[PDB]
Structure formats: structure tokens, C-alpha cells
Amino acid sequence: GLPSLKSSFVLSEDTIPGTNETVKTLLPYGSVINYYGYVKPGQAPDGLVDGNKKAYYLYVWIPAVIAEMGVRMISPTGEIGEPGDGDLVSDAFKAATPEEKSMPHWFDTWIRVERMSAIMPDQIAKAAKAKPVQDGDDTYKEERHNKYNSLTRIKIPNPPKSFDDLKNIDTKKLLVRGLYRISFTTYKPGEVKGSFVASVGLLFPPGIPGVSPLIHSNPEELQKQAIAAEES
Amino acid sequence: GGLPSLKSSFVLSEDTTVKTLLPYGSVINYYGYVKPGQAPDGLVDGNKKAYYLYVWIPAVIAEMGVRMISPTGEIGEPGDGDLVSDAFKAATPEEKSMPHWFDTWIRVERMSAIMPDQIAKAAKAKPVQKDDGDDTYKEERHNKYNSLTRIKIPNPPKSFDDLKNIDTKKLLVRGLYRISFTTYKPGEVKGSFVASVGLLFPPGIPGVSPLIHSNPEELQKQAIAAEESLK
Ligand SMILES: OCCN(CCO)CCO
Ligand SMILES: O=C([O-])C(=O)[O-]
Numbered sequence: 024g025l026p027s028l029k030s031s032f033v034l035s036e037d038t039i040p041g042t043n044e045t046v047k048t049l050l051p052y053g054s055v056i057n058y059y060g061y062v063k064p065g066q067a068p069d070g071l072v073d074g075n076k077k078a079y080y081l082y083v084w085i086p087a088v089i090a091e092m093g094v095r096m097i098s099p100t101g102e103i104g105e106p107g108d109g110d111l112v113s114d115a116f117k118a119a120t121p122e123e124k125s126m127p128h129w130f131d132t133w134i135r136v137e138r139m140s141a142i143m144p145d146q147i148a149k150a151a152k153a154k155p156v157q158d159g160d161d162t163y164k165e166e167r168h169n170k171y172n173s174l175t176r177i178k179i180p181n182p183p184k185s186f187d188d189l190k191n192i193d194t195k196k197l198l199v200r201g202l203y204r205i206s207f208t209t210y211k212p213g214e215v216k217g218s219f220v221a222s223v224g225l226l227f228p229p230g231i232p233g234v235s236p237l238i239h240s241n242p243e244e245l246q247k248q249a250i251a252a253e254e255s
Numbered sequence: 256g257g258l259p260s261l262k263s264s265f266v267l268s269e270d271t272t273v274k275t276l277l278p279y280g281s282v283i284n285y286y287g288y289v290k291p292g293q294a295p296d297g298l299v300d301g302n303k304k305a306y307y308l309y310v311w312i313p314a315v316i317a318e319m320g321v322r323m324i325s326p327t328g329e330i331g332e333p334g335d336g337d338l339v340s341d342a343f344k345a346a347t348p349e350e351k352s353m354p355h356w357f358d359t360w361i362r363v364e365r366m367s368a369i370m371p372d373q374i375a376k377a378a379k380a381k382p383v384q385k386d387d388g389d390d391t392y393k394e395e396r397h398n399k400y401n402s403l404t405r406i407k408i409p410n411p412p413k414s415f416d417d418l419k420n421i422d423t424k425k426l427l428v429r430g431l432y433r434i435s436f437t438t439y440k441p442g443e444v445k446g447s448f449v450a451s452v453g454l455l456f457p458p459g460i461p462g463v464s465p466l467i468h469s470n471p472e473e474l475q476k477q478a479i480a481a482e483e484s485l486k
């Protein structure tokens with residue numbers, strides 16, 4: 024499997040025998056979906072980033088308010104066999120051959136996250152056609168470099184060191200329910216293509232048993248999942 | 256920001272469950288660059304080009320970890336535990352930023368060199384005969400997403416602190432270790448990479464950094480300098 028996906032909160036702070044250089048144990052996200060996708064060669068970009076860079080979009084539906092969202096881009100994936108309970112697989116990814124899945128294409132991901140204009144599941148597809156909301160991380164956030172399995176995180180402002188101090192937090196400081204768009208691109212000589220897995224993790228405040236995010240590269244299909252999600 | 260922390264197998268902490276690993280105390284990151292078409296140092300699986308990295312370990316250790324990452328991109332000013340090869344330095348940024356493979360097959364084989372001035376010649380001889388454990392022969396055929404190949408002692412205690420009470424004969428021996436690395440098609444061993452080599456010493460035992468080089472003669476020069484230095 025993939026490496027564990029960790030929030031920015033520190034669970035333990037054990038100072039290693041003698042050496043003042045210490046070891047902080049991060050708290051893992053309680054709710055993680057790994058989305059396995061595939062960008063076919065010459066596939067048109069979903070959009071443009073930084074003027075001229077080909078960007079591709081994933082859409083995430085977050086149904087309750089959260090403490091944090093973490094996003095990791097790993098590529099390529101190779102074959103993974105039968106997906107597990109935490110895994111989702113794109114059609115393109117299914118149809119892709121083992122060889123196709125095992126070809127590397129890029130390494131450093133520029134990730135942008137933007138909240139879209141959608142108060143309700145049923146606005147998702149039009150929200151996707153619409154401009155993002157025009158503030159803090161739950162409206163806009165960008166990490167221009169993501170290498171070696173690092174994350175892009177959407178955080179509340181002024182987060183405490185102790186995860187447990189989120190018990191106290193005011194609702195109005197938490198990240199809002201809604202539709203978020205992940206844009207990803209790269210730098211030459213890389214190009215965004217082939218297999219990849221976007222791990223998305225949510226952190227809920229202490230005592231709130233989480234719900235999993237819904238994720239899809241297709242806003243109509245996510246919307247159906249989200250429309251169906253709310254009336255089940 | 257550099258590389259992820261290189262972790263040993265020893266569990267430092269456990270809780271609510273996910274476990275926190277003890278880092279290696281003595282770590283060196285070897286930034287290298289395999290030139291297009293470069294002749295293999297040897298063959299693996301009847302159809303794979305393998306490349307060799309030589310590690311000298313002067314004293315007994317509790318564990319060694321090897322992580323292979325590729326490509327690296329540009330890295331900025333090398334830090335206090337970074338070795339950077341001339342090939343890597345001569346490579347362009349574009350060259351170091353192109354990926355070429357993602358799944359590494361690693362072997363670690365001990366070579367028959369009891370002292371520094373055997374190193375160069377030992378590299379030319381077969382590995383020590385491989386039960387003999389991890390510190391003679393170890394292989395991990397798949398290393399993806401920054402996973403490690405570890406050379407471990409057999410029947411280790413749960414608690415690292417209990418290593419202070421271990422019999423010496425159980426610890427991993429001093430010597431010359433060859434790291435082989437190759438890959439599966441469609442990838443190929445090409446371009447930039449960083450091999451992170453971590454040592455775990457038993458507690459109370461000050462770490463000594465591993466000496467690492469792709470050229471055994473060069474490694475031998477360094478091992479020799481280090482040894483005669485200690486008188
Ligand atoms: O062609 C199949 C051989 N295969 C190794 C088996 O996993 C790929 C190596 O390049
Ligand atoms: O296939 C996919 O999932 C994509 O295009 O992002």
C-alpha cells in the first residue's frame with residue numbers, strides 16, 4: 024500500500040536518546056480516500072495554470088465542516104490490483120495497461136485548491152463550470168512544489184499545536200462544507216500524464232467520527248454520487 | 256526542504272493505532288546520476304541492468320537502511336550529510352528533473368573484505384557465501400514510494416533500549432556492503448537518484464557515518480585514511 028497520510032498536528036514529541044535533534048509524531052488523517060487516475064497522452068487539459076501550464080482537475084465534496092484537508096500526489100502508481108475500501112479507481116485507470124501504469128512522466132506537482140460556488144450537491148456540475156469563490160485556505164491555497172510524497176494542506180487559521188485543543192474551536196473558524204477543486208500541474212521536462220494517485224485526507228475535531236470525502240475527476244459523476252449521497 | 260526522515264524498524268512509540276519509528280542516527284544521502292545508456296555493473300533476473308554502490312561500515316551496527324529515490328531535481332546547497340557525485344554535479348537541472356523509473360529492486364550483499372585495504376580487490380571478487388542473515392545477503396524486489404530495504408538483526412527486541420544488552424555476535428558485522436539496484440520495464444535506471452543509507456548503533460555507542468562510493472578504489476582510499484587516522 025501507500026504511505027500513511029498525515030495531518031499537520033503533532034501527537035507525540037519524543038526527544039531521541041541524547042541528541043537534541045527531536046522526533047515529532049504527526050497525527051494521521053482519520054478519513055482518507057486514495058483516488059487512482061490516468062491522464063491519457065495528448066488528453067486536453069482541464070485548464071491552464073501560471074499562464075501556460077497544463078492543469079488537470081479533481082473535485083472533492085466535503086459534507087461536514089473540517090479541521091483540515093490534506094492532499095498528496097504520487098505518480099506513477101504501477102498496477103494495484105483490486106482496490107481496497109479506501110481506494111477509488113478512474114475508468115481510464117482501469118482501462119490502462121500495467122505497462123502504461125508503470126511509466127513515469129513527472130515528479131514535482133504544483134497543487135492548487137479552490138472552493139467552488141456550490142452550497143448543495145445539485146449545484147456541483149454548474150459550480151464546476153462556474154468560477155471558484157472569489158480569505159483563508161478553505162477558499163484558496165497553493166503549493167507550487169510537491170516532491171517525494173509531500174502534501175498540500177488546507178488549514179484553519181491559527182491552529183493550535185495540540186489536536187485536542189480543537190475541542191474548543193468555534194465552528195466559524197472551521198473549514199466549510201462544500202465543493203473543492205484540486206488543480207495539478209508540473210514543470211518541464213515533466214508533463215502531467217500516465218497514472219497517479221491523489222490521496223485526500225480529512226481531519227475532524229476530536230470526538231467527531233468523520234465521513235469520507237467524495238472525489239471524482241468528472242463533476243457530473245461526483246454530483247450524482249453527492250446527490251445520491253444525501254438521500255441514502 | 257530535503258528528504259524525508261530515514262526511519263529504522265524499531266518502534267519508538269505506539270498509540271490511537273499507528274506507530275512511531277526510531278530514526279537512524281547516522282545517515283548519508285548519496286546523490287548520483289546514471290548517464291544515458293551507461294553499461295551495467297552487472298545483470299539481474301536475466302534481463303535487467305544493475306548498478307552498484309559500495310558502503311564501508313567500520314564497526315558493528317544494529318541495523319542498516321537503504322532507500323532509493325528518483326529523480327531528485329535540483330537540490331540547492333548540499334547539507335551536512337549529503338554526498339554529491341561529479342556526474343550529478345555535471346548534470347543539468349532539466350536532466351535531474353526527468354523521471355525514468357519508479358520501482359527499485361535492491362540487493363545488499365556483503366563482500367569479503369575484513370579491512371579497508373581489501374576493499375578494491377573485494378569489490379572485484381564474488382560476495383560472501385550465503386542461516387546466514389541479512390548482513391550477508393538481503394533483497395527487496397520492490398521499493399516504491401520511498402520504502403526502504405533494511406538489514407536487520409535476527410530476533411530483535413521490541414525495545415531499542417534492550418539493544419544495550421545484546422550479544423555482539425548478534426549485531427551486524429563491520430565490512431564492505433554492495434548495494435545493487437535495478438528496475439522493471441518500462442522504466443529504466445537512468446538519470447538522477449539519491450540513495451539514503453542509515454545506520455542504527457546500539458545505545459551508548461556513538462555513530463560513525465557510513466562511507467559510500469560507486470568507485471571501490473575511491474572507497475578504499477577513504478576507508479584506509481579513516482582507519483590509520485584512528486591509530
Ligand atoms: O518482461 C517481464 C520481466 N519483468 C520482470 C518480472 O517482474 C520486467 C523486467 O524488465
Ligand atoms: O482519469 C482521471 O481520473 C483524470 O483524468 O484525472
Ligand SMILES: O=C([O-])C(=O)[O-]
Nearest residue numbers: 287288289340342469
Ligand atoms: O553518480 C554516481 O555516483 C552513480 O552512478 O552511482
Ligand SMILES: [Cl-]
Nearest residue numbers: 313314315429
Ligand atoms: Cl568489530
